[PDB]
Design an enzyme around this catalytic site. Structure first.
Site: not given
Ligand SMILES: [Mg+2]
Ligand SMILES: [Mg+2]
Ligand SMILES: [Mg+2]
Ligand SMILES: [Mg+2]
Lengths: 236, 241
Positions: A73, A89, A91
């Site tokens: 991300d 990232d 989640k």
């Molecule tokens: Mg993600």
């Molecule tokens: Mg993203």
DNA sequence: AAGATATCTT
DNA sequence: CAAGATATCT
């Protein structure tokens, strides 16, 4: 540090605010649904400002993917130090209890240095995950004056920041989309980093050699023990 | 009809409102992202209130899935007509430039279409209609987008110009898969007007269903059976072999 | 463990 | 276009 400051800003933003709807340029507000597809998007967007804030306080530029088939991300790195990039990232998963996350695929950037990743894999020195866990709980619109009437799409939300390898499991998180599976543990274990892999090196070798289906796995390895035995046999 | 009323409202609301952010209970506003994962979430939520309004005006109840691996987004039905359910599904895609060709993934071809109650809110045969509310937006580069706003007009919108249509799934269905590993039906790949106008490739909704219910999963296999409409009609002509 | 939930990329 | 990726769920 960048990490401590980020995890600190993340706990704070989370404790202080509650996303409750999408608003239009004219002041009309639409309620949020109570499902992961919605919350994941919302949790990521809620994180953006905070990640950009702290990144700058530490001199790191923040780059998101330009293409949609790319991990992570957010890519943070100092211009002076391009090979010292940090992958952050987001989640999400839910509880009604132990949780699990799908941790990215095991046949993309981890087996191919330039596959589905914003920058080559070898340019990242860390891979962090900001995990959001929400307890799962309107078909009308509202105005600014009615912000407290809008039902929230969750009973509570917790967030943690942890290194990917650290929270990785030995069982796939998904089949056709071949994702690494996290540990199946209580949130505590994620914050504390109570994984099963001895090192990041072990984590990587494991997922780089995990066979896609049980047929193939049943003659190589299906779990951490079998992998360690596979290693002893000389990787065969 | 519910249909005419629905499209008019979707079309009207589209031309009079622009979503620009997520707002918090406290009043803090977080700008939106520009990718499809974010926009399809936004578009569906924006749609919900309209679908519900028009539905009630025609005495229909609206039901959304309970579990997350279930089609469709909205199941509409009158108590009086339980076997006349209407499935209304929301799809979104983008275009790098206004007026380009577009394409959608129209759900799997191996779940409910091949198995009456698999991955669907209600048994497949209880629906008489399957509509697609399709949204098309021009991607805009993501910056003001990075900070929060107080109470709107200053916030950069992550898109240039949203387009919306309402159409039967069988009508806009194409003959090539929309995805590989997730076995989705692909739509026609054409301009927006083509979707609005129903300029698809199948002759009937039964041809649509037969084609997709017998479409093999890989090019390997399809090569011996059929890989496009032409091939399928020849295959139909020979006695399905 | 395998394949559904939506859509994109090379 | 094929096929496999992007995130999670069942
Ligand atoms: Mg993600
Ligand atoms: Mg993203
Ligand atoms: Mg939905
Ligand atoms: Mg949908």
């Amino acid at each position: 540090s960048l990490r401590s400051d980020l995890i600190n800003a993340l706990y704070d933003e989370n404790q202080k605010y509650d996303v409750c709807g999408i608003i239009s340029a004219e002041g009309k507000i639409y309620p949020l649904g109570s499902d992961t597809k919605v919350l994941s998007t919302i949790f990521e967007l809620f994180s953006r400002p905070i990640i950009n804030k702290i990144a700058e306080k530490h001199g790191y530029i923040v780059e998101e993917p330009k293409q949609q088939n790319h991990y992570p991300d957010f890519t943070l790195y100092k211009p002076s130090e391009p090979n010292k990039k940090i992958a952050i990232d987001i989640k999400t998963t839910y509880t009604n209890e132990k949780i699990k996350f799908t941790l990215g695929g095991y046949t993309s950037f981890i087996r191919n240095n330039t596959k589905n990743i914003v920058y080559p894999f070898d340019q990242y020195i860390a891979h962090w995950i900001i995990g959001y866990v929400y307890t799962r709980v309107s078909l009308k619109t509202y105005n600014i004056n009615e912000l407290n009437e809008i039902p929230k799409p969750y009973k509570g939300v917790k967030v943690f920041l942890q290194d990917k390898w650290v929270i990785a499991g030995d069982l796939a998180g998904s089949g056709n989309t071949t994702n690494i599976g996290s540990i199946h543990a209580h949130y505590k274990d994620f914050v504390e980093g109570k994984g099963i892999f001895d090192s990041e090196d072990e984590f990587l070798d494991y997922w780089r050699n995990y066979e896609r289906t049980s047929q193939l796995r049943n003659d190589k390895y299906n779990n951490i023990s079998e992998y360690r035995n596979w290693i002893y046999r000389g990787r065969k």
